[PDB]
């Protein structure tokens, strides 16, 4: 795997994300004492070839985590409707051995807009993701 | 005092029986450990079937001798 200091030029966004996903993961304190629940979701975007898939593997390796990887086009390619069970077992097995990081790579290939819908299995996986995202309010 | 009852699967069952009791009490003691009724049970002592109405002294069964246990229903 890749290290931690193998990224240059992105130092400003690194310090934005080191306090966001690395510091509350290793420290359950200083958020209950301050009375603020930590955020349970971040979104990275920009031009391609800028370090989207590289920075996520770098920030999760040398911190101590579970690092549940899940790819975009690899889901929804199943038959008889089992992509929801592969998503429900993804979030259930992560919280059993907390702390965990669920990195959903290429999320644009999973959730398009409702005016460009295709078939019926595309609606079934965007509403499963919106329901299961709200279930992580138990800290 | 000591006795050794062995089935056909190569499993010996330990049991502590009195030297001057009946054979029916031996079939009752092996009933409590497993849950097999003693009506279909039969005891073979070196090719000789032990009768339940007799005792341990007339058959000359000595201490910790190897016994045999087999199941055979009367009507079945």
């Amino acid at each position: 795997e890749v290290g931690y200091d193998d990224i240059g030029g992105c130092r400003k966004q690194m310090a934005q994300i080191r306090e966001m996903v690395e510091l509350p993961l290793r420290h359950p304190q200083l958020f209950k004492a301050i009375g603020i629940k930590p955020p349970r979701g971040v979104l990275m975007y920009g031009p391609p070839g800028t370090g989207k898939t590289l920075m996520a593997r770098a920030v999760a390796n040398e911190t101590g985590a579970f690092f549940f990887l899940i790819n975009g086009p690899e889901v929804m390619s199943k038959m008889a409707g089992e992509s929801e069970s592969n998503l429900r077992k993804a979030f259930e097995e992560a919280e059993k051995n907390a702390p965990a990081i669920i990195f959903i790579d290429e999320i644009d290939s999973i959730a398009p807009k409702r005016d460009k819908t295709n078939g019926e299995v595309e609606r079934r996986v965007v509403s499963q993701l919106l329901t299961l995202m709200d279930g992580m309010k138990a800290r | 005092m000591q006795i050794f009852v062995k089935t056909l699967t190569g499993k010996t069952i330990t049991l502590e029986v009195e030297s001057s009791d009946t054979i029916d009490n031996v079939k009752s003691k092996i009933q409590d450990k497993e849950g097999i009724p003693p009506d279909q049970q039969r005891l073979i002592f070196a090719g000789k079937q032990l009768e339940d109405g007799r005792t341990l002294s007339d058959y000359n069964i000595q201490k910790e001798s190897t016994l045999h246990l087999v199941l055979r229903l009367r009507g079945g």
């Binding site: 899940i70 790819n71 409707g81 | 056909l8 699967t9 087999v70 199941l71 055979r72 079945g76």
Partner: protein, 468 residues
């Protein structure tokens, strides 16, 4: 690698189904458009027309050869006939190198759809004689408890099912077990040590342990009625405790195949059960297990449940990761899609059926083992037929102290009699191998006189006459 002699014969034949001209054909007489083209042997539409419920795996091997080998270049010879794995690859070819810390979708086992297997390895089990298995039920008629056995037999072609192998059995061996009225459970260590020496004598006689039988009768009142009806449509077909014993027996005996990458695939093993029909008799039935899902998950995840139709699914302890199991069933209002977020999933879905039968008595190719079928068996200690050398004065005796060779050789071809003689090992192993080959093969008259002229057979009848 070399496969069986029966398996290579089914591979060479194409097994095409011819058709005739029809009114729908618009072509000439010297041709075929689509309606009189040769039918493939793997089409399931022709199968359910003749009430064949499976597609005869050697034809299923042909339908995957068309997908592996194509008209294009390819240059591969992949032949994707392998056991689908539900275990987790540890190396994972990604950044989540330990499974304690990390698992992604390319190594995660997918959710089991529970689709039924469309192909069976053994297509039709057949028997040799109705007097052979009559002794097996007679063991229950004396001690009143259930029995157990192992079936030794061979294989040959089957012309009823298109590209199908039929299962022939010759003799039944019983291991020493502890009987019980409710069920049965024996030690696997003393059986495996006993079955190792029976496989020695089965090699020279041409036999192989390919089956097993266990009884389940529950007699009603011993009068007009024969047995109760335990296994029906609403009840269980096979109990989940006997699925475990059927799964371990198939993994111990693999079937060699050149098309598989590991060298072994599609085990040819039969499990027969004596259970009785619905109405009034003790008619038997046989089903074998499925290779696609059940054969691999039995190494890690099969746990016993209190229900005979279902089996409990246990939990993961740091290496035993299992996926969710789904199946479709009807609710109180309608028919719905997959509901199972609950343990104790049924095991009757993972069984494929067989067609049992007995051949006609007027003609056959051979029978090879019908001597008496009344000799006392080797490990029938619950019954009274477990005799010493006193039986050999009663059974054969070199009949009436001077026996005719047409009446002496007809008794010597018994399976359990020959397996009782060599345990004493009086004869030489070279003279014993020609003794069992004379009893099982034809033109035995020139070699039987060689046996009676040998000094080993003379010492056998002399040591028997002085003893009781």
């Amino acid at each position: 690698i070399k496969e069986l002699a029966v398996d290579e014969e089914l591979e060479k034949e194409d097994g095409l189904i011819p058709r005739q001209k029809s009114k729908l054909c618009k072509h000439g007489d010297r041709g075929m458009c689509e309606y009189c083209s040769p039918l493939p042997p793997w089409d399931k539409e022709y199968h359910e027309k003749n009430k064949i419920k499976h597609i005869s795996f050697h034809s299923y091997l042909k339908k995957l050869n068309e997908n592996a080998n194509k008209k294009e270049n390819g240059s591969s010879y992949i032949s994707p006939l392998s056991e689908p794995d539900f275990r987790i690859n540890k190396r994972c070819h990604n950044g989540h190198e330990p499974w304690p810390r990390g698992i992604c979708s390319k190594c995660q086992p997918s959710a089991i759809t529970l689709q039924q297997q469309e192909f069976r390895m053994v297509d039709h089990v057949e028997f040799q004689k109705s007097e052979i298995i009559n002794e097996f039920i007679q063991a229950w008629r004396y001690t009143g408890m259930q029995r157990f056995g192992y079936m030794y037999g061979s294989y040959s072609k089957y012309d009823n099912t298109p590209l199908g192998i039929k299962a022939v059995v010759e003799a039944i061996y019983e291991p020493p077990q502890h009987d019980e009225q409710d069920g049965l459970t024996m030690d696997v260590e003393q059986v495996k040590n006993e079955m190792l020496q029976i496989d020695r004598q089965a090699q020279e006689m041409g036999l192989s342990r390919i089956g097993l039988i266990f009884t389940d009768l529950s007699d009603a009142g011993a009068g007009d009625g024969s047995v109760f009806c335990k296994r029906h449509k609403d009840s269980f077909f096979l109990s989940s405790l006997e699925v475990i014993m059927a799964a371990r027996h198939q993994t111990r005996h693999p079937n060699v195949s050149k098309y598989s990458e590991q060298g072994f695939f599609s085990s040819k093993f039969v499990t027969c059960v004596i259970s009785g029909n619905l109405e009034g008799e003790i008619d038997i039935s046989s089903y074998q297990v499925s290779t696609e899902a059940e054969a691999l998950v039995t190494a890690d995840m099969i746990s016993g449940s209190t229900f005979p139709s279902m089996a409990y699914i246990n939990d993961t302890t740091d290496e035993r990761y299992v996926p969710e199991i789904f199946y479709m069933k009807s609710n109180e209002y309608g028919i719905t899609v997959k509901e199972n977020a609950k343990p104790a999933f049924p095991v009757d879905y993972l069984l494929v059926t067989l067609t049992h039968g007995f051949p006609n008595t007027d003609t056959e190719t051979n029978s090879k083992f019908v001597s008496s079928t009344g000799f006392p068996w080797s490990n029938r200690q619950a019954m009274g037929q477990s005799q010493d050398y006193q039986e050999l004065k009663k059974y054969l005796f070199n009949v009436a102290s001077s026996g005719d060779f047409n009446l002496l050789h007809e008794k010597i071809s018994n399976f359990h009699l020959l397996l009782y003689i060599n345990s004493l090992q009086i004869l030489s192993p070279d003279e014993w191998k020609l003794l069992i080959e004379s009893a099982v093969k034809n033109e035995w008259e020139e070699s039987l006189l060689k046996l009676v002229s040998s000094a080993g057979w003379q010492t056998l009848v002399m040591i028997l006459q002085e003893s009781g």
